Amino acid sequence: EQIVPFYGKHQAGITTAHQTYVYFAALDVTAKDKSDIITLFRNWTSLTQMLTSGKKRNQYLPPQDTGESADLSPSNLTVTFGFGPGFFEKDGKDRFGLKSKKPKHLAALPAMPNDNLDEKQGGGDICIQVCADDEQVAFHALRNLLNQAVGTCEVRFVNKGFLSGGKNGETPRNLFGFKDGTGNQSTKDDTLMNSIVWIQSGEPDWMTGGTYMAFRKIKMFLEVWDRSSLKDQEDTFGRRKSSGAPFGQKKETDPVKLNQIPSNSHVSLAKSTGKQILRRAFSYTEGLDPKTGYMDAGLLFISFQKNPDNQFIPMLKALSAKDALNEYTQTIGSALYACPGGCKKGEYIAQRLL
Amino acid sequence: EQIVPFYGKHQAGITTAHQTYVYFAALDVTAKDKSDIITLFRNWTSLTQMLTSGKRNQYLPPQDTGESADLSPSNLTVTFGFGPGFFEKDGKDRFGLKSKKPKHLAALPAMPNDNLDEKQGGGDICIQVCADDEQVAFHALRNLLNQAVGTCEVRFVNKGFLSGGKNGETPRNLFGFKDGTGNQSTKDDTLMNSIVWIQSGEPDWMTGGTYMAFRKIKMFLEVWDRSSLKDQEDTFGRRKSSGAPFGQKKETDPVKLNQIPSNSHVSLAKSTGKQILRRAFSYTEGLDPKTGYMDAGLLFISFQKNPDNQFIPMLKALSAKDALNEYTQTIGSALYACPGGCKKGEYIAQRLL
Ligand code: HEM
Ligand code: HEM
């Protein structure tokens, strides 16, 4: 029962229970003909469906499967696809006749204070989010999906993350030791998810049942953070580190009292925007940082909103300019993708290409 | 019941059951006084014992970074070793330990198909953090590395994974082959004492210890995935799906050497007549600049009581004629001497006194 359904009204991996491991990849389409892209997505639909279920010769041919996931369980594997702005208009030229179908809010995220964006660390035409409760299962799924795109796409970047939840179900803690996700509404609340995440109208029909996905690769200066006092740490966020409770409250789930937390507190500024998003982030570590000599670690920030201009960008502007966490963080990758709606069993992903 | 004992006759993490995740780090000692190193090892012993088992001033930084608070120890083990530079660095013996150097501790010989990065191998101290949860393991490494600031400088930090079968099958590496069939059973004390554990002939601090070989081997996943199934099985000498040697039925059947290729990986290794305890992990590190492909490979880690007799012969054989050379390139190399176990009232490598 470790299988997450692939076909559905929405794509899996958004309101799906947060897995432990993620591989996050972005592709740039190198094919000139649109029919190559339809071929891509057709084989991706077939492969993803095989990978997300338990579906398991000519010795002179390559094996159709790389093989490292053979004895493993699906471990709640989900794969989520999205389109960046470059898929519809690249350098002003709309190369596949899709400019008339561009999502209404799909564009590069605005530059923000404290940005240190690496251009090849964000963007892309296609993004693939592979989530699973086992890293080998997840890398295996991404590896075999990327192999299908050779000749059609060029891999732009590949990110890799983790986020462990509590043994008794406690909110998972990020690399600063604070629980991450209390502020999210319940993914089992259909009304709120339809109000925060899922699109019903106002978009091209392929976005119905879809959403927007924001990606920010945020470096976390662990060495500076670990020298900061516990009180300094609790004051940057506005919650007690151990319990995850707001200031002046008892438990994690008590409501936030804004007049009880600092003005430049992370939670204060975000909740003060009046907007909500669905945060589904993962932590990352990447060895040492050259010239820095410290652990290169941080957060792969991923959130889903039906209107990023109303829900995400106001929060980004607020946090970018005034935020105690900026003292310990620097965003180095940025991207916004449009996720199509779900895939019915007889169709292929994003079948608006026809 | 997810706890691996830290105190013992040997260090944990060598013959201990292979966990899923590893963080592998190497440090260079920047401290000039040997007593700063003794302090470091004491606090490392104290912290490690708290970390590997289950375990107040808001104005001070937290003594624990906290991200593992709600997690199980998940068989966390931490294993320590010393590189050659700890005993003699640039001709200088910096801590009066040259008279205590292990007999077989030295940099590994340069090999054909080597492409070594100097800062991807070597080091004076190595720390191996293994656990069945990556967050648990990184947390253990993070807080151990925090205690070394001002005493050591971190040389490199590697990060790996290796998942075993849902029903206990041998874990498969990123080439899809079962990896570990050839190791003796780590529950055979007689075999482990003959392959891994040191009994005599070494300084007393190595009694119950071993040597640890580290080879960071890049795996050209893109070349391998385009190769025929015949190329893949012929490079190893075992069937990919079953893990069986050629002309044999099951994975654990003995290898028939006259039925696998001469330059086969299993042929060359088995032909040395030597054995080691292989405890490796797979790694992935994003894309490779200039290559544009997945940067992945194997963190080769193995334990031998005599690297000059057991490991170096196998390296020479494989370096020259291994069919795996077509899909792999070693980019990091290191050999560490791991001290023996730690009794409850002592600290790691207490021979420093
Ligand atoms: C390294 C980067 C970040 C870290 C470590 C971090 C951590 C946290 C923590 C500990 C909380 C409080 C617990 C919770 O509500 O889950 C929180 C809340 C929140 N964060 Fe972040 N966060 C980061 C980046 C961001 C970014 C980039 C955004 C938006 C652009 C964002 C939006 C929010 C929101 C909306 C909340 C909930 C506010 C509420 O309670 O109503 N976070 N974050
Ligand atoms: C990317 C690098 C490597 C890969 C993918 C790899 C993989 C494998 C595989 C699939 C086997 C057969 C199953 C088994 O016996 O466990 C094997 C056997 C073995 N390999 Fe490796 N290996 C690599 C590097 C090395 C290195 C660097 C050494 C030694 C310097 C080594 C020594 C051995 C030994 C001793 C055996 C068992 C021989 C026997 O069957 O008696 N391997 N390896």
Author numbering:
A (entry chain A): 56 to 111, 117 to 414
B (entry chain B): 56 to 110, 117 to 414
Authors' account:
Bacillus subtilis BsDyP belongs to class I of the dye-decolorizing peroxidase (DyP) family of enzymes and is an interesting biocatalyst due to its high redox potential, broad substrate spectrum and thermostability. DyPs are a family of microbial heme peroxidases that display structural features analogous to chlorite dismutases with an α + β ferredoxin-like fold. In BsDyP, the heme cofactor is partially buried in a predominantly hydrophobic pocket lined by the conserved proximal ligand H326 and catalytic distal residues D240 and R339. Access to the heme from the surface, as defined using a 1.4-Å rolling probe, is made through a distal tunnel and an open wide cavity.
We deleted the N-terminal sequence of BsDyP to achieve homogeneous preparations of recombinant enzyme. The truncated enzyme shows spectroscopic and kinetic properties comparable to those of an intact enzyme. This form (named hereafter wild-type BsDyP) was used throughout this work. To investigate the structural consequences of evolving the wild type to 5G5, the X-ray crystal structures of 5G5 and the wild type were solved at 2.10 and 2.49 Å resolution, respectively. The wild type crystallized in the trigonal P3121 space group with two molecules per asymmetric unit. These two subunits have an r.m.s.d. of 0.31 Å between Cα atoms. K317 (and D314 from loop 2) establishes salt bridges with D250 (and K248) from symmetry-related molecules in the wild-type crystal structure. The catalytic D240 and R339 residues are part of the tunnel, and three water molecules were found in this pathway in the wild-type structure (and four in the 5G5 structure). The wild-type BsDyP displays a GdnHCl mid-point concentration (where 50% of molecules are unfolded) of 1.4 M, and the native state is more stable than the unfolded state by 7 kcal mol−1. Furthermore, the kinetic stability, which quantifies the amount of enzyme that loses activity irreversibly during incubation at a certain temperature, owing to misfolding, protein aggregation and covalent changes, reveals that the wild-type enzyme is clearly more stable than the variants with a 4-fold higher half-life at 40 °C.
